[PDB]
Amino acid sequence: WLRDFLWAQSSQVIQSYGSALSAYGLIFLGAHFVWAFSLMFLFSGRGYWQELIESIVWAHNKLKVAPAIQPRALSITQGRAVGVAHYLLGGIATTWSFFLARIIS
Amino acid sequence: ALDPQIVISGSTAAFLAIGRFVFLGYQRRFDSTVGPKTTGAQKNSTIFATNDPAGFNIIDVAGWGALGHAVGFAVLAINSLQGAN
Amino acid sequence: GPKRGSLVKILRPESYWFNQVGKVVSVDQSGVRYPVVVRFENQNYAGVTTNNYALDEVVAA
Amino acid sequence: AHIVKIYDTCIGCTQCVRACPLDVLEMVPWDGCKASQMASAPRTEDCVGCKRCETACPTDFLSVRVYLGSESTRSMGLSY
Amino acid sequence: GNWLPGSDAPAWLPDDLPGNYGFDPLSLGKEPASLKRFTESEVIHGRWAMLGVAGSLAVELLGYGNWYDAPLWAKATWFGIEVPFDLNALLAFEFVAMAAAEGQRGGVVYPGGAFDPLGFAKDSSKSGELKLKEIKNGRLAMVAFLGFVAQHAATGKGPIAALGEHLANPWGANFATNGISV
Amino acid sequence: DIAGLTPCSESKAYAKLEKKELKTLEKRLKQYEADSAPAVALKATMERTKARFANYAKAGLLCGNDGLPHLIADPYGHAGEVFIPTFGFLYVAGYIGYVGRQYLIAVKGEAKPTDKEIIIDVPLATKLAWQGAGWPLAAVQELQRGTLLE
Amino acid sequence: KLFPKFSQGLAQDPTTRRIWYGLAMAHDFESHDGMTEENLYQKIFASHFGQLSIIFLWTSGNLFHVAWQGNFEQWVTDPVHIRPIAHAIWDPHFGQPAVEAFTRGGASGPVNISTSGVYQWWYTIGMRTNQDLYVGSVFLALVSAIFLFAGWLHLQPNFQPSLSWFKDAESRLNHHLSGLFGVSSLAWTGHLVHVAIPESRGQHVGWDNFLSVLPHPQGLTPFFTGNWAAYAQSPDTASHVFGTAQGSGQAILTFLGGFHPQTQSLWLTDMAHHHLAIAVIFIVAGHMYRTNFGIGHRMQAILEAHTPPSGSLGAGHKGLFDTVNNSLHFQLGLALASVGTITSLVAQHMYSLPPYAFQAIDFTTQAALYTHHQYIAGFIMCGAFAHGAIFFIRDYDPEQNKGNVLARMLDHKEALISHLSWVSLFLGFHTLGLYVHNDVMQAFGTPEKQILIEPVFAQWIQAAHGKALYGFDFLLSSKTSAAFANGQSLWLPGWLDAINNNQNSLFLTIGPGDFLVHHAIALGLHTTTLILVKGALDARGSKLMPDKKDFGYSFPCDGPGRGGTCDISAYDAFYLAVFWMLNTIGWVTFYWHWKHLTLWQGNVAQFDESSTYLMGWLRDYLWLNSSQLINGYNPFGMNSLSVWAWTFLFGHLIYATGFMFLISWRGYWQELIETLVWAHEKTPLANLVYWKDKPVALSIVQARLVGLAHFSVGYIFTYAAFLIASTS
Ligand SMILES: CC1=C(/C=C/C(C)=C/C=C/C(C)=C\C=C/C=C(C)/C=C/C=C(C)/C=C/C2=C(C)CCCC2(C)C)C(C)(C)CCC1
Ligand SMILES: CC1=C(/C=C/C(C)=C/C=C/C(C)=C\C=C\C=C(C)\C=C\C=C(C)\C=C\C2=C(C)CCCC2(C)C)C(C)(C)CCC1
Ligand SMILES: CC1=C(/C=C/C(C)=C\C=C\C(C)=C/C=C\C=C(C)/C=C/C=C(C)/C=C/C2=C(C)CCCC2(C)C)C(C)(C)CCC1
Ligand SMILES: CC1=C(/C=C/C(C)=C\C=C\C(C)=C\C=C\C=C(C)\C=C/C=C(C)/C=C/C2=C(C)CCCC2(C)C)C(C)(C)CCC1
Ligand code: SF4
Ligand code: SF4
Ligand code: SF4
């Protein structure tokens, strides 16, 4: 699978640049980005984020640019939802750019 | 080349006579302010015990000549090289 | 204690409103320790707009 | 077992007793507060450390604290 | 007379100091401990660089010497005459000489005794009037010596030769033909 | 020239990058008539693509051994590459930021400010929008005055 | 009463957790039962010995198998065209053609190729036969036994040192600076002069005859005379062949610069003079703190004196003597920080200035090493920043440090954290923005529209160093500069010759592809430091949790209430920080690998042109150089790259388990177990077996570690397989 399917077939997507199919290369990379991006949410917890936000809020208040709507880290549940959502979207979109550029070319 | 017997004896004497008669009112007075301790409270007072006017122990000798020889060997050593600017 | 509705700075370091402003609702005239009941515009993490403080943990400014 | 303490900032609103799933806390008379009552933790050997008590406290900062400590069969929620 | 008309002189410079025209914007002498130090070092920089200038003018002033081209010989050469050696010998007998005499400053401005034989410092009412003149000939020299180093790095030239180049072509040869500003 | 790299106006590789791209589009354009729709696009792109190369050669950027224009980011041959644009940003970003500052503060004193972060007072914002044109002159004067910091 | 012997609390745990923690709690002395400062220091000391004994045994093991199973002697005779043997393999699992496959070199069975550079190390130092390796193996084994001995020795009440002794910092500093640094480098220099240099000149000097052999013709006459220049009279010729008489000189101490042209490594004469020179500075400097003689400095007095006027640094460093001498974690933080920097220091200087003969000709070895020390440096750094906050929690005395640099540090910590945040967001946005911009232009067939910034600043530095490519003419480039004229007749001819040979690694050529990646690395640095610093400074208290210091360094959370408090502890901060370690040094090692791979391959234009966009990394780095790797086996047949490809997939599989433990958490698994524990107890026959230790789900903190561990191992192993298999 690693070689005869993944490696060999990804050929047309990886060189899709300069063509009609280049959007699939862009989406190929973008979907990896967004997939990996999900891992930040999935692997972490809002305790860190809320303290981060404490420091940033300091910085805002120092310059009289603090919002009335008190900036809060996502809930644990929302962290999970954002995580799974970006994980799926990334994964699926990558397979999507893969097949279509592959089979069209 | 300069001779190796005059400069080592000269530079050693040039830093021992400097230490003997100048740097003592500078050295002995942050020697008494400095008091080595660690979170509350043996110094060999036999090696420091000296029948001297101002009190010159065996360490002061091996410390003030160390300048003199770090001078002496630095002088002689670079006289060997032909470093032209 | 402070006069009712007066703007008061908090000086209890472990508070969510530390060095922040609040308004006095009523200072209980009794032998209670934290008589100065303060209410704020902005909530804390625990969904609470109000707390009790001692006379040395307020300063009317 | 876990350690549970009540500090003097307690108002005695009783939410922390009423919230507990394992009956660790109780209300006692006191002389400090407007409600004339304070919270207490005499049964910490049955304490699980699930921190509902803390989540229930209105005081700033919380006037109940649960310090997760040495763990025993009860504190680990075991039925087996 | 303070350094910038209008401006108020800070709290820390008493004008009973010699040459206080109220210049410490960066407020480096705010602390009096750190001030007493700088009042001292000012005067010394003042004193050296006054000789420093006087010296490296006199070199090329009457003879075909130059202060930039003086160390060339690393046989030394005073006033056209030969010399008593080399490098190591000067270093040693300059180290000890300086190290001893500067070592024995257990810091003073006007130590007198030895250093005023002819006896000017004396008569309180004029003693200050010299100390102004001291520090102002002090500063004017410290500026000039920087002026001697600045012009050297731009050109080759050399103080009295640069002065002579400027007198020939003043409009032409000045400080906008080098690079401090392009 | 600077870092030894050639100027795009002269360099061979850059002028051979012209050729390759153009001669990719002229291998396509064969497969269509001259009157047709896509032929007007594959001519117009070429015209634009050939114009583009010409307009960096006239701009005078430094092109390397690669054939691609590299940029210069310090001092004055190549000011306009970064040094001018740079100010462009700090202005428009400073514009956005200071408008946003003047909005949040202008709301702050009005019982419930949180409503104005959502149901935004548009005719407040659109007045602050224009006011935020002269922002560095205000931003400086506010740093002076000493109302800028808590 | 049961193991954990050192913890009543854990020992009374009825479950499998007791076990896990027991393993996890083992080295944390301060947390054990009935512990004192004395037992702490003493156990730490003994543990240090224990470590040393494992190190010496390990090193001896390597030498042992190179001597016993390797082709050390075939290498010395022909270093260019022999693959250095690490070890033999006896695998009963191998198939017929596997045994044929792995028989490389002159081996009589299956063997593995060393990629440690221990060959070139040894060989350059003087090691010539298997005999030498055996004798060294015995020696160091003896040192291992000696160290073990020593550990148990100062355990007895007669030999137990007092806490006062441990707190004598001045003495340890003096001795380490003068002896451990000074004397041992002097003695090495002794080894280089007496053994390495003669060995390079083709005169084999051993234990039996060194004393009888003159390293210099008029030896020890210059030394006492002060005619030191005689030691640099005639260096090795430019046509000298390493390990042979041909072209060899007689000089023992030089400042030549550049490389030994055939080997392409630094001159052992330069190395000798280097070690000797530093040795002197160390020896003189190691007489600086006061002990039992009256002469020397006070640390306390130096630190307390350094408080600037007008309180711009508050109370300065007052009180830091005590809070450092008391705090062990502080010392480990400073140590790990410095050690991590110097580990990367080593890595970055060794590649560009290789010191070993016929290294750098060994691609695989070089790549393996440079990846090695950068990852080691990363972990070490995270660890430094991990005993950072342990200080902040357990050790800090707020009263005793009042208004110092440290307390003032805590004071404005929101500024520090928020400005790190700025610096990381800036880089993250712009660098990614310029790459993805670069990709889109590449995609639409207009690479001329790329934003390629030339690294003018580094190109300037390289120019100041004397590379002439860029034509700035500064310092060591310009022939009319004092800097040039001073040392032109010293070492600059060897230097300038080496910097401008672009087939070597010394100050490689730099273009816009270099520009982007360094800012990617900067993103790496600043963000990881953001996590670590934030974790350190908020270890004590925050607005969400003001009493955090009461709990300590690792805790799961503080409940779901008032928003939710997952990953709140400084522990978890360091955990989060490891992922950036991994990612950042991942970027740095890639950067490294490729920019060399394209140099060795003979087409640097591949790198300069594809490194400007990320597909370029994907296609031209990853997709291209795994071709041979993934082929190690196919349905048709097999070749020698079996192990790497096996291990490649091994690493990936480890990497994805990690995701399992990181993403899915306890409540699911416990209830899973909850049904399983019913299932067992009403299964007949199996009924007759019951567990002693109640089966329970791994903790949160356990899950946290176990994920991280799998992730890191998978990371390292996967890369290692890739790096080696591709470079080889
Ligand atoms: C009594 C008297 C006298 C005399 C005296 C004397 C005679 C003295 C001497 C002294 C001396 C005579 C001393 C010496 C010396 C010292 C020292 C202290 C030394 C040191 C050294 C060193 C430190 C070294 C170093 C080194 C090394 C080792 C290695 C390499 C090189 C070098 C150099 C780095 C008189 C008459 C005058 C007067 C009266 C009294
Ligand atoms: C020129 C140039 C350069 C350089 C630069 C630099 C070097 C810089 C630095 C800088 C710095 C060193 C800075 C600092 C700063 C500081 C601070 C302190 C700040 C502040 C800020 C603020 C305060 C703001 C405010 C505001 C406004 C105004 C508006 C909007 C809103 C807000 C509120 C945000 C380069 C080469 C790159 C490129 C070319 C050009
Ligand atoms: C091994 C050997 C060798 C060689 C050697 C070398 C190369 C070196 C050595 C070295 C050494 C062995 C030593 C060095 C040095 C030492 C010292 C020891 C120094 C010191 C100094 C000091 C102690 C001073 C002090 C002071 C004082 C007291 C006062 C004031 C301040 C001061 C800081 C000046 C030879 C070949 C001959 C022979 C064989 C063996
Ligand atoms: C790293 C290495 C190793 C190891 C090493 C070691 C660990 C060593 C040690 C150690 C050693 C191998 C040492 C030696 C030493 C020697 C000596 C030390 C000698 C001496 C002699 C003499 C005769 C001298 C004398 C004297 C004099 C004359 C004067 C002054 C005093 C004295 C006593 C010094 C091996 C190869 C395995 C592997 C590879 C690498
Ligand atoms: S909740 Fe906090 S306040 Fe209400 S009772 Fe329990 S402790 Fe007293
Ligand atoms: S923790 Fe859960 S159980 Fe232990 S007391 Fe507070 S509430 Fe009752
Ligand atoms: S960690 Fe698991 S338990 Fe502790 S809070 Fe976050 S979620 Fe609730």
From Swiss-Prot, chain A:
<feature type="transmembrane region" description="Helical; Name=X">
    <location>
        <begin position="21"/>
        <end position="43"/>
    </location>
</feature>
<feature type="binding site">
    <location>
        <position position="48"/>
    </location>
    <ligand>
        <name>chlorophyll a</name>
    </ligand>
</feature>
<comment type="similarity">
    <text>Belongs to the PsaA/PsaB family.</text>
</comment>
<feature type="binding site" description="axial binding residue">
    <location>
        <position position="40"/>
    </location>
    <ligand>
        <name>chlorophyll a</name>
    </ligand>
</feature>
<comment type="subunit">
    <text>The PsaA/B heterodimer binds the P700 chlorophyll special pair and subsequent electron acceptors. PSI consists of a core antenna complex that captures photons, and an electron transfer chain that converts photonic excitation into a charge separation. The eukaryotic PSI reaction center is composed of at least 11 subunits.</text>
</comment>
<comment type="function">
    <text>PsaA and PsaB bind P700, the primary electron donor of photosystem I (PSI), as well as the electron acceptors A0, A1 and FX. PSI is a plastocyanin/cytochrome c6-ferredoxin oxidoreductase, converting photonic excitation into a charge separation, which transfers an electron from the donor P700 chlorophyll pair to the spectroscopically characterized acceptors A0, A1, FX, FA and FB in turn. Oxidized P700 is reduced on the lumenal side of the thylakoid membrane by plastocyanin or cytochrome c6.</text>
</comment>
<feature type="binding site" description="axial binding residue">
    <location>
        <position position="32"/>
    </location>
    <ligand>
        <name>chlorophyll a'</name>
    </ligand>
</feature>
<feature type="binding site">
    <location>
        <position position="49"/>
    </location>
    <ligand>
        <name>phylloquinone</name>
    </ligand>
</feature>
<protein>
    <recommendedName>
        <fullName>Photosystem I P700 chlorophyll a apoprotein A1</fullName>
    </recommendedName>
</protein>
<feature type="transmembrane region" description="Helical; Name=XI">
    <location>
        <begin position="81"/>
        <end position="101"/>
    </location>
</feature>
<comment type="function">
    <text>Both potential cofactor branches in PSI seem to be active; however, electron transfer seems to proceed preferentially down the path including the phylloquinone bound by PsaA.</text>
</comment>
From Swiss-Prot, chain B:
<protein>
    <recommendedName>
        <fullName>Photosystem I reaction center subunit V, chloroplastic</fullName>
    </recommendedName>
</protein>
<keyword id="KW-0812">Transmembrane</keyword>
<keyword id="KW-0472">Membrane</keyword>
<keyword id="KW-0150">Chloroplast</keyword>
<keyword id="KW-0602">Photosynthesis</keyword>
<feature type="transmembrane region" description="Helical">
    <location>
        <begin position="58"/>
        <end position="78"/>
    </location>
</feature>
<feature type="transmembrane region" description="Helical">
    <location>
        <begin position="6"/>
        <end position="26"/>
    </location>
</feature>
<keyword id="KW-1133">Transmembrane helix</keyword>
<dbReference type="GO" id="GO:0015979">
    <property type="term" value="P:photosynthesis"/>
</dbReference>
<comment type="similarity">
    <text>Belongs to the PsaG/PsaK family.</text>
</comment>
<dbReference type="GO" id="GO:0009535">
    <property type="term" value="C:chloroplast thylakoid membrane"/>
</dbReference>
<keyword id="KW-0809">Transit peptide</keyword>
From Swiss-Prot, chain C:
<keyword id="KW-0603">Photosystem I</keyword>
<keyword id="KW-0809">Transit peptide</keyword>
<keyword id="KW-0934">Plastid</keyword>
<dbReference type="GO" id="GO:0009538">
    <property type="term" value="C:photosystem I reaction center"/>
</dbReference>
<dbReference type="GO" id="GO:0015979">
    <property type="term" value="P:photosynthesis"/>
</dbReference>
<comment type="function">
    <text>Stabilizes the interaction between PsaC and the PSI core, assists the docking of the ferredoxin to PSI and interacts with ferredoxin-NADP oxidoreductase.</text>
</comment>
<protein>
    <recommendedName>
        <fullName>Photosystem I reaction center subunit IV, chloroplastic</fullName>
    </recommendedName>
</protein>
<comment type="subunit">
    <text>Interacts with ALB3.1, which is essential for its insertion into thylakoid membrane.</text>
</comment>
<keyword id="KW-0793">Thylakoid</keyword>
<keyword id="KW-0150">Chloroplast</keyword>
<comment type="similarity">
    <text>Belongs to the PsaE family.</text>
</comment>
<keyword id="KW-0602">Photosynthesis</keyword>
Curated annotation (Swiss-Prot), chain G:
<feature type="binding site">
    <location>
        <position position="669"/>
    </location>
    <ligand>
        <name>phylloquinone</name>
    </ligand>
</feature>
<keyword id="KW-0148">Chlorophyll</keyword>
<comment type="function">
    <text>Both potential cofactor branches in PSI seem to be active; however, electron transfer seems to proceed preferentially down the path including the phylloquinone bound by PsaA.</text>
</comment>
<feature type="transmembrane region" description="Helical; Name=IX">
    <location>
        <begin position="573"/>
        <end position="594"/>
    </location>
</feature>
<dbReference type="InterPro" id="IPR020586">
    <property type="entry name" value="PSI_PsaA/B_CS"/>
</dbReference>
<comment type="function">
    <text>PsaA and PsaB bind P700, the primary electron donor of photosystem I (PSI), as well as the electron acceptors A0, A1 and FX. PSI is a plastocyanin/cytochrome c6-ferredoxin oxidoreductase, converting photonic excitation into a charge separation, which transfers an electron from the donor P700 chlorophyll pair to the spectroscopically characterized acceptors A0, A1, FX, FA and FB in turn. Oxidized P700 is reduced on the lumenal side of the thylakoid membrane by plastocyanin or cytochrome c6.</text>
</comment>
<dbReference type="Pfam" id="PF00223">
    <property type="entry name" value="PsaA_PsaB"/>
</dbReference>
<protein>
    <recommendedName>
        <fullName>Photosystem I P700 chlorophyll a apoprotein A2</fullName>
        <ecNumber>1.97.1.12</ecNumber>
    </recommendedName>
</protein>
<dbReference type="GO" id="GO:0009522">
    <property type="term" value="C:photosystem I"/>
</dbReference>
<keyword id="KW-0411">Iron-sulfur</keyword>
<dbReference type="GO" id="GO:0000287">
    <property type="term" value="F:magnesium ion binding"/>
</dbReference>
<feature type="binding site" description="axial binding residue">
    <location>
        <position position="652"/>
    </location>
    <ligand>
        <name>chlorophyll a B1</name>
    </ligand>
</feature>
